[PDB]
Amino acid sequence: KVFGRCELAAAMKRHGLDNYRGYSLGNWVCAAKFESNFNTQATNRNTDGSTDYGILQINSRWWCNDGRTPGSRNLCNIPCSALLSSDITASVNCAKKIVSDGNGMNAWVAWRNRCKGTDVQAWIRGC
Numbered sequence: 104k105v106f107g108r109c110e111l112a113a114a115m116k117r118h119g120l121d122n123y124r125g126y127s128l129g130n131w132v133c134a135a136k137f138e139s140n141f142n143t144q145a146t147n148r149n150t151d152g153s154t155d156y157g158i159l160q161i162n163s164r165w166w167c168n169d170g171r172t173p174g175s176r177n178l179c180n181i182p183c184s185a186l187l188s189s190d191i192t193a194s195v196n197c198a199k200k201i202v203s204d205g206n207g208m209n210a211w212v213a214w215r216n217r218c219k220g221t222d223v224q225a226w227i228r229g230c
């Protein structure tokens with residue numbers, strides 16, 4: 104599924120991301136835009152043996168288990184394929200875990216580089 108920004112915003116809001124750990128909804132929508140272009144099926148297979156999965160490009164070393172990544176921690180306790188679902192619940196739940204495990208949103212390189220310090224509210228404006 105490729106979400107619209109407003110539809111994603113509403114779905115993220117239903118799962119409690121607005122203001123989750125002090126990060127406004129627009130931050131999360133902006134992170135998704137630049138990580139995956141709102142595509143739930145996005146994958147980026149890295150040279151280090153890991154792969155980034157789904158709408159938030161969550162990595163298989165620390166966060167989800169794809170079975171094939173060295174050093175797997177599976178801190179989200181999920182198979183990475185769950186992060187490729189049409190519904191975003193598993194991605195959102197793991198994103199919240201990533202923050203809960205001592206990370207800011209700077210854990211997402213696209214967030215740091217493309218959303219941090221910007222007008223993130225543009226991404227929910229008009230929704």
Ligand SMILES: [Cl-]
Pocket residue numbers: 118119192195196
């Ligand atoms: Cl959730």
Ligand SMILES: [Cl-]
Pocket residue numbers: 118
């Ligand atoms: Cl929930």
Ligand SMILES: [Cl-]
Pocket residue numbers: 168169170171172173174175
């Ligand atoms: Cl693995």
Ligand SMILES: [Pt+2]
Pocket residue numbers: 114117118190191192
């Ligand atoms: Pt939902």
Ligand SMILES: [Pt+2]
Pocket residue numbers: 114117118
């Ligand atoms: Pt929901």
Ligand SMILES: [Pt+2]
Pocket residue numbers: 117118119192195
């Ligand atoms: Pt939820």
Ligand SMILES: [Pt+2]
Pocket residue numbers: 118192
């Ligand atoms: Pt739900």
